[PDB]
Coordinates of C-alpha atoms and ligand atoms in Angstrom, one line a residue:
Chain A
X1 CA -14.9 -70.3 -33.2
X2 CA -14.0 -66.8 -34.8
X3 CA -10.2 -65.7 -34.3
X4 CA -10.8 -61.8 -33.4
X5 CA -7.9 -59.9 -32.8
X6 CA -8.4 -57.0 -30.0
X7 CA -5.1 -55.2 -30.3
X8 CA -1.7 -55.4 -28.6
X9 CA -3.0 -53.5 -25.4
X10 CA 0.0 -53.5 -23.6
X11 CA 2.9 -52.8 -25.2
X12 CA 6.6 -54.6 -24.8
X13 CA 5.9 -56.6 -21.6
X14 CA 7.2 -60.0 -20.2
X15 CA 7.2 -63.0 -22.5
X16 CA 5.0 -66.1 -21.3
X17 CA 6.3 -69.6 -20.4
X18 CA 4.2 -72.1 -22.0
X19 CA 4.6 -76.1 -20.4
X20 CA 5.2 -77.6 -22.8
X21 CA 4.6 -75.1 -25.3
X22 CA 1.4 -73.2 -26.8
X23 CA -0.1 -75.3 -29.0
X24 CA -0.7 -78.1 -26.5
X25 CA -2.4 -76.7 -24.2
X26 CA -4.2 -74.5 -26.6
X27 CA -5.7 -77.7 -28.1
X28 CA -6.3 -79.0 -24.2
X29 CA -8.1 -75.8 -23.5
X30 CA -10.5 -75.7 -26.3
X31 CA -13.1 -78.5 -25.2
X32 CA -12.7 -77.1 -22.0
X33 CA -14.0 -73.9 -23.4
X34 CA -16.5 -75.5 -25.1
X35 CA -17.9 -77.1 -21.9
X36 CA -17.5 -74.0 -19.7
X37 CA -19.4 -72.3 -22.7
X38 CA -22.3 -75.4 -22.6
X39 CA -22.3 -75.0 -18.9
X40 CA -22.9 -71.3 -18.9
X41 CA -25.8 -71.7 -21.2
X42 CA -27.4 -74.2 -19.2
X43 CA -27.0 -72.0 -15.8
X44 CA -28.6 -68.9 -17.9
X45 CA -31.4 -71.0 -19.1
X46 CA -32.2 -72.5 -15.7
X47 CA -32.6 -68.9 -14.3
X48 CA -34.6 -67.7 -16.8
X49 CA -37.0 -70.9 -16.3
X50 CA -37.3 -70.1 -13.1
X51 CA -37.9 -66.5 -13.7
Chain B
X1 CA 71.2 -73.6 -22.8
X2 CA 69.6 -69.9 -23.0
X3 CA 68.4 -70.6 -26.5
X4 CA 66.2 -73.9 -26.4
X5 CA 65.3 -72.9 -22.7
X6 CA 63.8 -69.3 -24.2
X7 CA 62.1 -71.1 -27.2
X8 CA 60.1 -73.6 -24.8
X9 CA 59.4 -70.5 -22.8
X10 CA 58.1 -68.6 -25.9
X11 CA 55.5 -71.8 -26.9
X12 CA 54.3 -71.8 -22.9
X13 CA 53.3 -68.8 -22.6
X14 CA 51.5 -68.9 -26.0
X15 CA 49.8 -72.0 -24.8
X16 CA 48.8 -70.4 -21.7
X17 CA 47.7 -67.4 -23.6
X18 CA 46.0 -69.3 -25.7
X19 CA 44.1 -71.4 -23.2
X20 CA 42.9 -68.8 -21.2
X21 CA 41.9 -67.0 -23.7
X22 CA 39.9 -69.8 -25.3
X23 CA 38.0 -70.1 -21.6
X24 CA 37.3 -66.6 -21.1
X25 CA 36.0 -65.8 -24.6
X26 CA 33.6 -69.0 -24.2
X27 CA 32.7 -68.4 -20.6
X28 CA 31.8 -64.9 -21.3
X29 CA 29.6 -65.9 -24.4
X30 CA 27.7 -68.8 -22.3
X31 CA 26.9 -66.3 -19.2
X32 CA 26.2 -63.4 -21.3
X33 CA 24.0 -65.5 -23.7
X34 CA 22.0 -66.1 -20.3
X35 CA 22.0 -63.0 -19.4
X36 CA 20.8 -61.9 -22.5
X37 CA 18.0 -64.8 -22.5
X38 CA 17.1 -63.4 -19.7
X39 CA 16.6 -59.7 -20.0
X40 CA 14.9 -60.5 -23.5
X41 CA 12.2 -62.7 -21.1
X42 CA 12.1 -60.3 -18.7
X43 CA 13.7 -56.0 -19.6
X44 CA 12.9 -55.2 -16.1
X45 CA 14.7 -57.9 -14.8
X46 CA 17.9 -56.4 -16.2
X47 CA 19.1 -54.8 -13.0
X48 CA 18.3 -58.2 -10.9
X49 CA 20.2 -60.3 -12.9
X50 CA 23.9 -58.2 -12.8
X51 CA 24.5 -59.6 -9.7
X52 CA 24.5 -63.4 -10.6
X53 CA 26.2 -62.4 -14.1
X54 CA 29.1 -60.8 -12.7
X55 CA 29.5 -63.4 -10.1
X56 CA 30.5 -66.1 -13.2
X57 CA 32.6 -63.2 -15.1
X58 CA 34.0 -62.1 -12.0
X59 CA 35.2 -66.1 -11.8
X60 CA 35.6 -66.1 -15.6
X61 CA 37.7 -63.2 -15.9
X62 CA 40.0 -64.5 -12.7
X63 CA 41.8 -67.5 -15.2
X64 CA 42.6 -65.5 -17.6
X65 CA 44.0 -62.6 -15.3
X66 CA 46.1 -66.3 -13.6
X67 CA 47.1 -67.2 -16.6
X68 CA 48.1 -63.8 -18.1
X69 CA 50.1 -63.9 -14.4
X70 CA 52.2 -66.9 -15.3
X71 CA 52.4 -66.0 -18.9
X72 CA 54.5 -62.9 -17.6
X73 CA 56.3 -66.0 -15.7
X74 CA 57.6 -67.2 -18.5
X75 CA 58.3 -64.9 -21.0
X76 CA 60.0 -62.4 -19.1
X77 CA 60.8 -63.7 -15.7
X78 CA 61.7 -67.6 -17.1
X79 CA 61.6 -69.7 -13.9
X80 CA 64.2 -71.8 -15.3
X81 CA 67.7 -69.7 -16.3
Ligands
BQ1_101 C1 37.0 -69.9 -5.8 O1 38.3 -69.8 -5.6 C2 39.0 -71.0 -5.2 N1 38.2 -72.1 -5.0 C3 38.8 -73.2 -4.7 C4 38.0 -74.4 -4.4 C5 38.6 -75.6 -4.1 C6 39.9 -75.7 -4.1 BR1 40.7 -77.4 -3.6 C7 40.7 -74.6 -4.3 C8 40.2 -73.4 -4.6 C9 40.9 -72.3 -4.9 C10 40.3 -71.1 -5.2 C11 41.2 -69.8 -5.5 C12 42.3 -69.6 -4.5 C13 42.1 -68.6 -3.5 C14 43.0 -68.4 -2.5 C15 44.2 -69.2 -2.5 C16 44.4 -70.1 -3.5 C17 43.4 -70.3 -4.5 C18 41.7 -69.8 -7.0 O2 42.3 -71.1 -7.2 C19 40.5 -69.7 -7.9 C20 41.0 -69.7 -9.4 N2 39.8 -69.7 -10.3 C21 38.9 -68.7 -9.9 C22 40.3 -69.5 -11.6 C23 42.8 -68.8 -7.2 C24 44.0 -69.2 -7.5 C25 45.1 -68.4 -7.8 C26 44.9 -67.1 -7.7 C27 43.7 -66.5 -7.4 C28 43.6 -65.1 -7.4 C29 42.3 -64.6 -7.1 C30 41.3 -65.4 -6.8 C31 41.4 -66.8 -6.9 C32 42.6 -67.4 -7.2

């Protein structure tokens, strides 16, 4: 994947608590990204089969 | 008799000066370093979190004013003369 940075949006707003910090459940959430991503992909392509 | 009996005086009320002084300026900095924790989490929780603040300084602050008390006691009042 490609880091893109949108902007700051918001501005000063209220900090995030992160169990047991960011970087674990970063790395916990990536696959799972991945396989919502794969998942999507198959959905779209059934459709379209269908269509 | 009034001599030795003003001296121990004198070094009782600088130890309960000093004590409560040593509580209040660490009770202070331990609440107020929550506090501040917690209006650096949260700005708009600033007026929310007053209540619970005060609560420990209003306790805090309640020694020392106790011990100021009996330092008065001792240095001009002596309860022993
Ligand atoms: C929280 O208050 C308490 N909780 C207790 C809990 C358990 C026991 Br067993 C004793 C407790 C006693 C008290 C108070 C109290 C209230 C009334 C009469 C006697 C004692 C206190 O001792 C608190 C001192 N602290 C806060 C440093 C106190 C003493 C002296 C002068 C005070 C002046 C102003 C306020 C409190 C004053």
């Amino acid at each position: 994947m490609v880091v893109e940075y949108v902007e700051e949006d918001i501005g000063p707003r209220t900090l995030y608590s992160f169990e047991p910090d960011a970087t674990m459940l970063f790395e916990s959430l990536l696959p799972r990204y991945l396989t919502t991503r794969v998942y999507a992909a198959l959905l779209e392509s059934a459709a379209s089969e269908l269509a | 008799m009034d001599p030795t009996i003003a001296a121990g005086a004198l070094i009782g009320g600088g130890l309960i000066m000093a004590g409560g002084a040593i509580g209040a300026g660490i009770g202070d900095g331990v609440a107020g370093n929550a506090l501040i924790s917690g209006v650096a989490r949260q700005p708009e929780a600033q007026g929310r979190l007053f209540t619970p603040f005060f609560i420990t300084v209003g306790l805090v602050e309640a020694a020392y004013f106790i011990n100021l008390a009996f330092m008065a006691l001792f240095v001009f009042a002596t309860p022993v003369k």
